[PDB]
Each structure stands twice: as C-alpha cells, then as structure tokens.
Enzyme design. Structure first.
Site, PDB file in Angstrom:
ATOM      1  N   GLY A 266     -45.503  16.895  38.919  1.00 40.88           N
ATOM      2  CA  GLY A 266     -46.066  15.584  38.656  1.00 40.88           C
ATOM      3  C   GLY A 266     -45.020  14.490  38.785  1.00 40.88           C
ATOM      4  O   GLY A 266     -45.312  13.386  39.253  1.00 40.88           O
TER       5      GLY A 266
ATOM      6  N   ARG B 182     -38.505  15.117  39.544  1.00 37.73           N
ATOM      7  CA  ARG B 182     -38.382  16.573  39.561  1.00 37.73           C
ATOM      8  C   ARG B 182     -38.493  17.125  40.985  1.00 37.73           C
ATOM      9  O   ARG B 182     -37.910  18.160  41.308  1.00 37.73           O
ATOM     10  CB  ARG B 182     -39.400  17.237  38.634  1.00 37.73           C
TER      11      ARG B 182
ATOM     12  N   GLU C  17     -53.713  17.902  35.815  1.00 39.24           N
ATOM     13  CA  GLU C  17     -53.791  17.982  37.276  1.00 39.24           C
ATOM     14  C   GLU C  17     -54.578  19.145  37.853  1.00 39.24           C
ATOM     15  O   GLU C  17     -55.121  19.038  38.964  1.00 39.24           O
ATOM     16  CB  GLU C  17     -52.382  18.074  37.875  1.00 39.24           C
TER      17      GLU C  17
ATOM     18  N   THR D 204     -45.454  20.672  33.611  1.00 40.02           N
ATOM     19  CA  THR D 204     -45.347  20.872  32.186  1.00 40.02           C
ATOM     20  C   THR D 204     -46.717  20.866  31.534  1.00 40.02           C
ATOM     21  O   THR D 204     -47.712  20.415  32.121  1.00 40.02           O
ATOM     22  CB  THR D 204     -44.459  19.823  31.507  1.00 40.02           C
TER      23      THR D 204
ATOM     24  N   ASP E  34     -44.104  21.390  24.797  1.00 37.33           N
ATOM     25  CA  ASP E  34     -44.266  21.086  23.378  1.00 37.33           C
ATOM     26  C   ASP E  34     -45.555  21.694  22.865  1.00 37.33           C
ATOM     27  O   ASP E  34     -46.294  22.295  23.630  1.00 37.33           O
ATOM     28  CB  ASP E  34     -44.212  19.574  23.120  1.00 37.33           C
TER      29      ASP E  34
END
Lengths: 227, 227, 227, 227, 227, 227
Positions: free
Chosen positions: E19, E23, E180, E89, E203
C-alpha cells in the site's frame, strides 16, 4: 423431473405438501385408498391415492424455502399440479396463539432474499389463494377447530442468535414461524395456480401429542383440495 | 392531535378512510345522519354521524403512505379508533381485473421503505383483519358486486419512469396499485386494532362514471364497520 | 392533469408549494392580486395571481414524498412550470436551530426509498437550484431574518418508534425534519427545472404564533420567484 | 497520528486537501512562504506556510473515500483542524459542463457504503459548509472564473463496467465525478467543522494544460480559507 | 495509463503491491537488482528489477479499495500484468492472532459496496488464486514463519465509531483488518489473472520493529511470484 | 435434538454431510464397518461406524441453507461435532469446469440473506478450514483426481428465471453452484469448529454414471476426516 422420479400423469392435480416425508407416508396410509408411491428420490416420499373418491397426491417438501421451491417448481412445471396445500407445523410467536391451534396463512413475512432478488426495491407480500383459504376456513369452522387466519413468518434461520425481531413481528400480529410458505405462495402466484398453507402450532418459541389435531387439519386440507 | 382538531370523543371507534377529503364529505352527506364536521385542518375533512343507527366517522387521509400514516397514528393513539376501513380507488395491473371491480386487499406489496426501517433484513407482509375482510366480502357477495380478494401494490411513486416491475407484479397476481394500504395495515397491526382496504378499480394502468359502484362499495364498508 | 383540473395556461411558470392547501389560500388572499382558483380537486387548492405585477401561482402539495411527487410531476410535465419553491414548516433536530428560524435547504437526507429505486446501489443527494437558493438567501438576509442554509431530513415517518437515527442525523448537522424536499429537488433535477425549499421552524422535536415570520418567509420565496 | 508524523501545532487550522501529494508540494512551493514539510509518511506530503500573511497547511489525501477519511479523521481529531478545503480534479458527466470549469460541490452522491453503515435505512446527503461555499463562490465570481455550484458524484469505482448509472445521474443534473467529497463533508459534519470541495474539470467521461485554471482555483480556495 | 506513466513493457508480469509507495522503494532497494523506476505520478512509486534472476515489479497502491482498484485495473488492462501479490500490513481482530504473524488471505469480507453494485442481491466472496496461495504457504512454512491462512476484513472505514461488528467478525474467525484485498481478488478474478495477499500483523485492534518479519514476508511473496 | 433422535455420544466428532440422506446410507454401507443408524427423523438418515479403524458419522442435510443450518447447528451444539465435511454435488458454471471434477470450496458466494442479517452492511465471505482443505487437496492429488480449489455459489434458488447473474459469477471465476456451503462454513466459524465442502460436478448449467468418482471423493473426505 430432476428431484421427482414420477412418470407423467402419476401425480394428481391437487396435492398436500408436508415438510416431513414421513408425514406424507402417514397421510397416505391413514387417509387415502388405492395408494401408490411415485417417488423416493432423496427419501422425499410422494404418494397418489383417492380420498372420498377423488384422486389426490401427498409430497414431502423438506425444510426451508430452497427445498420447497425445488419441489413446487417441479410439481407445477413438470407435473401440471394446480392446487397445492402445505400441511405443516409452526411455532407460536404471538402471545394469544396456543399449541394445537390451526393457522391458515393469509400471507407470510420472511427473512429470505428470494423475493428481493425477483423484485428489487420492493417488498413482495405473498398471498394465499382466497378460494382455497375460504374453503379451508369454512371446513375448519364446521369441524369445530380453533382456526386462526393471519400472518406468519417464513424463516430461513431456525436457530437465531437474537430473537428481538421475531418478538417484534409477534408484536405486529404475526402468529407463528415456519419455513416454507413464502416460497409456496410466491411460486403459485408466478404460475397462476392455487396455494394455501394450513399449520398446526406445535410449540411456543418464548407428533402423537398432536396427532388428533393433526388429523383434523389434514382432513380440512383434503376437504379444501377435493372441492 | 397535531393534524386533527377534534375533541376527545368526537370521532367514532369505526371510521371510513377515503384518500380524498371531498369524498369524506360526499360519504357523510349521502349516507350519514346527525352529521358533524370535527376537522378541517389542512382541508382534511372529517365527519361523524350515524348509519343505520350506529355512530361512525369518515376521515380523509390524503395520498401516500406518509400522509395516511399521520392520520392513522393520530386516530388510533389520540382518538381511540378501533376499526379502520380505507375506501379508495386503484388502478388495475393484472390482466383480468376490470374497471368498477371492488378489490378487498388481503395484503399489500410496496415500494415504500417504511417496513424495512422497522424490520431490517425482513420482508413484512401487512395483513388485513380477517374478521373485517370476511364481513366485507360477504356483504359484497350478497349485494351482487364483482368482488376480488387478493394482493395489491401500495406505491410511493404514482409516476414511474419504468413500469417493468409493476408489470412483473401483475404477472405474480398483484391486482391493482394504490397508495395507502401498507401503512394502514401495518399500523393497525402495531396497535392491535382492525383494518381493511376496499377499493374500486377506476382505470387500467396498461367519479360520476363510477358513482353507483362507489356507493355500493361505501355501503359494504359501512356494513363491515357497523357489525 | 389527473389531480389538477386547470386548463393549459392557467398555472404560472413560477409557483409556491405549501403542504397545506389552506396556506395556499392564505398566501393568495394575503399577497396576490387578480386571483383565480384553478383547482379544488381533492381540496388541494391552487391559485394564480399577481405579485408586484408578476404572475405567480400557489399550489398545495399535501404531506409526504408521494403526495408532493404527484403534484410536482403534473405541474412540470402537464403545465410547464419552471420555478418551484416549497414554503413549509419543519421541526428542529439540531441543538442550535430555533423556532421561527427560516431554513433554506441545500440538500435533503431521507428515509424514503424513492431514489434507491431510481439509482440502485447509490446514495442520491438531491440539490437545490443554487440560483434560487442565492436569491432567497440574499432576500432573507436583507429582510433581517434568521436564515440557516443547510441540510434537512425528508421523512416518510412522522411518528417514529425510535428517534435514535433522527438524533444521530442532528449530530451530523442536519437541521430539521420535514416531509417533501427530497421529492421536489429530485424531480426538478430530473426535468431540468429550478427548485428550492424555504421552511419555518415550527417546533423542536426533542400558525398565528408564527404568522409574522411565516409572512416574511413567503415574501422572500415570492421575491426569489419573481426574479 | 497513525499516518501523519507531525507534532502538535505543526498543522494549521485551515488546510487545503489535494488528492495528489505532489500537488500539495506544488501548492506550497507556488503560493506559500516560510514553508515547512511536516509529513512524508507514505509519501503523503503535508506542508505548512503562510499565505497573505496567514498560516495555512496543504495535505495530500490520496484517492478514494477510505484514503481521504483516514487523513481527515486524523487532521480533525489529532491536529485540531477546523477548515478543510479539497482542491481536486473531476470528470464532467453532465452535458453542459466544460473542461476547466470550476465546480464547487454543494453536496455529493455516492456509490460508497460509508453512510449506509452509519445511517441504516437512510440516504445521507453530505452538505458543504455554506459559509465557505459562499466565500469561494464570491471569490471565483470576482476572479472571473466559470464557477458551477451543484451536485457531484463521489465514486469508489473509477473503472466501471457499465456507465448507465453515471449517465443517469448526469441526466439528473449531477455535474462531475470525483472520489473524495462524500467523506470530507460527512466527517466535517460529524465533528462540527467546516468543509468545502472545489474542483477543476479535467476531462469529460463521455496538469500543465490546466495549470492556469488550477492556480486560479487554488487562489480562491486559499481566499476562502484565510477568511 | 491514467495514473501510471510507464511505457509498454516496463512493468513485469509479476508484481508486488504494498500500500505504501515508500515500501515499494524499500523492496526495490533491498531485494532487486538492475532496478528502474517507471512511475512517480502522485508519488505512487513503481519499480522493475530482477530477483534471483527473474524480472519482477513492485508498485504502491495507496490505501483503500478505490485506490488499489485504480492501480490494479491499469496494471492488468494496460500493462498485461498476470500475477499480483499484495504485501501489506493488517490489524489483528481475532484473539489468537499475534503481532508479526503472517496472514495469507484465502478470501475477504468487506464493508465496501463495490461487489454489491456488480452482483445485486448476492454476497460475492473474493477468492485467492490457490496456486499462488499454496506456493506462498509452502514458502512461509519452509522459512519457519508463523503463517495463518484464513479470512480477513477489507475495510473502507479505518476509524469506526462502533467496533461491534468488527468484534463480531473476529468471533466468526476473521483474522485481521486491512483495506485492499477485496478489490485485488475481485479484479483479478474478473480478468482471469492470479492474485494473493500476504500481510504482516502490525497491531491488535482491541516498521523497523517488524522489519525482519516484513523482509521474510517480502521474500515469500517474491518466491511465490518468481515461480 | 429437535430434528435428530440420537442419544448423547452416538454421533462421532467427525462427520460427512451429503445433502441426500440415501447417499448417507450408501456411504455407511459401502465404506463403514460396525454401523448403526442413529436417526430417521424426517427420513434424514444418520449413521455412525468405523473407517480404517476410526469412528466417524454420516448425516444427510437436505437441500438448501435453511435445512443444512438446522442439522449443523444441532450437530455442533447438541452433539459436540468438531469436523464437518459436506460431500455433495454441484453444477458447473465456469467454462473450464468439467463433469466429474472434484471441487473443494475455499469460500462461497450466495444469494441467501443469512449473513446480511448477522452482519448488516457487510459482505461476509465464509471460509473453509485450511487444515481440512489442505488434507483433502493432498489426498485428492495423491489419488489422481481432477481437483479444483476455488469459489462456489451457494444458491437458494435452484430454478431461476434469469441466469444472467450466475453467468456473470462464472465470468468472475466462480466454479459451480450448490445449495449448502455458505451455511456450513459460516456456522463452523461461529462455533470455532472445522468445515470443508468437497463436491462432484454432476452437470453443466449452460448417480451411477458418477459412482466411481463419487466413491473416490468420499474416500478423500473420509481421509481428511480421520486425520
């Protein structure tokens, strides 16, 4: 047809539709003469015989809108059936409805999506054939049964996590919950044929112990059928 | 109440509910004796008088679910009304339904959202009070009217861009289109009171010219009311 | 047209649209000269007259999306109306909105299904004509009124069992609740004509006592109309 | 915050919100003085500087309701932002809307589910802050731009298989399609802060070539912001 | 294409889809050789290089269904991409899911409307390409990672007012929430190409601290890609 | 339980779930030793026996989401069943799927409302237990079957008036249509137990003739069960 192994002509134009195929066998054995069994595909027994001299059939439907829809579509489209009377059980959800009452469904509410697919944006209210309804009501009144004519819920979900909505429906006069009527009434209307649901109240949400009442119900359904 | 200027006790427990307030005036003048007018707020005329010696009221509702809902809520909750019979017009959408037929609505389909708000995920099928239905049906049969008992569409949208769905509903036996019954039947059920809609077919989708039939309809509605 | 008995040409291209037909009569009597009444079908009074020398009409709509939709469709499609200004009442649902404030609706939220039918899968946000909006806003500002321009709720359901959602809408800035704007704005957009709703706050959810403010509102609506 | 690495106080209370973070950099470099960059997390550049002596920020949002919702929630809830003006592009879908027109969104339609989740059964119409709208409209009028105030579509789906609904929306006056406004307006309303979307028409559905118009648009957005 | 400035042939048929475009830059710098950057439109970096001698690309998608849909449509339709692996993530929402676990999505739930628009009346369950899934699962198992294969939620709304439904989904085994996968899997299925999402748990709802795990995940995604 | 007359302990923790109760009898007679029949309520045969020395059961479910939901709820909640593998038939709807292929459902699409009731506003994607899926896939691969792992449609409506949507689903890679998987997978997830559907393709939409393939499928389902 796909799910019924009967030859053309083996199924009568008037048919009783219990959910339980073993109740179809009971009805055939108890009430009909000159009986044959025309189907055992999936164990979904169907029989044809005579009642008071008139040819009639009895066919299990299984439980739920999708199961009864299969059988009703095949009966109407492949076997020329014209009068279809569900004879079933239900659970009371309105405070004044009692065990062993007979409920004749005028219409049905549902949590099924089957009519939203067909009529997007609309609420379709499936309606009984009034002619059959009146015949069954008059027969049940004459026979001295507790007959209640009103609204029912056709449920997809027998085991619900929350019963809030079912309680709310009962507060709006919906009498009982069962799992077939929306489909029977909608398909009969689609094809221009005649349907009714007659139900015995077997428990309250919030077979031998009702065999006498159940028999009397079968009798008025047969009466409405043979007219 | 907010939209009815009547004092407590001025409105009878049985009431006829035309959509057109001028038809309320016509009904009061033509059929009732010892008449008073209890409301003219928004021109929505309401009257109380006697018919065959029994006290009855007649109240315009306006057109559409939201308008009739206002009046029916106020009548039930603020004035203690118990028997509510809509007497209206409708447009035929099923091929065999004729102008001047009288239709007694068993239930109603709708394009309104009013019941989806109340029963999310469910299709609520609003049902007539069977007692009133039978009384009106028997009265209309005795009077020699063409009475058709079945399903109707309660429409929000009188002028639709596409009539495909209305045609499809007619193919599923829905008899005619009108603009009130879903709300009347749902609210009556909510409050445990008795409702019926009796309709005259005024045109085919696909007042003096029906005044005689309209009178006969008013007569059976009053008959069902005064019982 | 079906619900308006006017001849071609009897209705002006600019029209005020109160919900209450008796307010149409009040507006005609109080503000207009050379007045005629062109409709009394269903008591839904409509008038044409002159204001500051310009021809204008005033037509009751009744209450609710379905009622106003009927009248607006007929006015636009059968009578060639081009500027339509609702002049109505509303109930405040946002904490800072006061009785006698004038609200000019930029857009409207709704619990109606009318736009979900037309635009399946979409949320349609009905929009005022900005030209009319600016004219009314400027007129109300000049006149020294408390004018609030923002969002309103067009409700089908005046009497709700739960007001949780209405409160939540107020928490998102929705100013007041009324029963017509979604339909007026949507139909005007459909037909490429110009619409606005100007509303007086009559109560807070959680005619002579507002006659002066109501007059001032009628004045700015007429002002925006005659430009 | 989770997606913005700014310290408390680094982001001004008035902010411009392009979708493209490189346009945030362009705006900061072209219009602002005493500029710092307070964020580069995910490349989503944000800057603070001065315009005509007043402190203002500019923050990329990315494309689509979910992306802008993240940034707007963080800006409002974590950084105390009070005036939020999207400055973006759009595609015309109404026949009279031209390339390089500036559109100020009064409200937005959407194919997003974000408001149906929050307001089940309702159509929420997200509304601009009228104060900001008027300021931007007046600034654009003074500057001699073609400014169109009206409805837009906030789309989730840039590449649709069928454009039938988009065409239908254009037939109901919806001016252009973009991918952010519903979320900006809804969240600003939720939190009681002020939002507006100002858009340049970049193509017709059915950066240097619009850099002059784009600059003029940025100028009126900054003007509406610094008031 | 509209949002990617690459020439034909510059993007490899296998692509990794973080995303965060930064990255993408990290992946290219850390894992790939002979790297070029083919896109910086909107800062949405895309790179092509070689991994273990095979040509592969890495392209940021931005956050949310609408953003990734744009990029995936363009990659598939304009650049001939055939194998698409999101590397992202997520936040754990099922009690037994731990930070730094790798989740390979079999399918995804969503609060997006994107599939209800395409398949009205249906629930579309977007499915991973099993071939890619097995390759990634086997690679992650060999590498000694905690790999969990199951269901995820693709959310439009990162900041929800109520988390009741998210908790309920976790009670039905949904592992984590991200923004996504529904779009990637649906579009890949539409066009007959191959997609997978591999996610690191960052998380628990109720970059250097996961850089080692993140690297290992990138390694298995590249492994599944180069086969 | 309500629909199963078994005593506690009579049903094994691993169970095969054909729709046809006569196929349950076939499976028990053909594959199991030391067999008893624990249920014949509604003719819905259930058996327990041993396979390769391990205790296992086989239970008919009937057709459709509502029927299988009843049985699965009772098996899980009243009989402590932990591993549930549907062994059924399906109709191909994707062009490359062949008669006698074995399909292992990763997930299922549906026209049922059962998950919209539970998760309003969400699309719930019911997921197979990956452990069971891998075991069945590996067993079928070893046995030399044509095994296809992918998406299926769980239909309420076997006889549809329009097949447009079913065709569209096939264009998005959905392999076949059946009538149970959504419910099995959703309920297993609800209760934290393990489910899989293994299906034989019996026809193409657009028992002895598949008895060998059907046997091989039963064998891999039993294999996945006894591990």
């Amino acid at each position: 047809s796909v799910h019924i192994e009967a030859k053309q002509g083996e199924i009568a134009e008037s048919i009783l539709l219990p959910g339980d195929p073993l109740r179809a066998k009971y009805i055939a054995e108890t009430f009909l003469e000159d009986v044959t069994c025309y189907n055992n595909v999936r164990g979904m027994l169907g029989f044809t015989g005579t009642y008071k001299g008139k040819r009639v059939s009895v066919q299990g439907t299984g439980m739920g809108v999708p199961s009864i829809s299969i059988y009703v579509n095949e009966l109407i489209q492949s076997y020329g059936v014209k009068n279809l009377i569900r004879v079933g059980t239900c659970g009371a959800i309105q405070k004044d409805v009692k065990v062993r009452d007979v409920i004749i469904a005028m219409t049905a509410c549902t949590d099924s999506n089957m009519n939203r697919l067909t009529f997007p944006g609309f609420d379709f209210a499936p309606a009984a054939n009034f002619d059959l309804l009146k015949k069954a009501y008059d027969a049940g009144t004459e026979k001295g049964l507790h007959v209640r004519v009103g609204n029912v819920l056709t449920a997809d979900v027998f085991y619900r996590e929350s019963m809030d909505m079912v309680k709310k429906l009962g507060d709006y006069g919906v009498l009982a919950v069962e799992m077939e009527t929306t489909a029977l009434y909608t398909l009969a209307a689609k094809y221009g044929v005649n349907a009714l649901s007659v139900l015995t109240v077997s428990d309250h949400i919030f077979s031998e112990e009702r065999q006498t009442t159940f028999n009397e119900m079968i009798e008025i359904a047969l009466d409405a059928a043979i007219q």
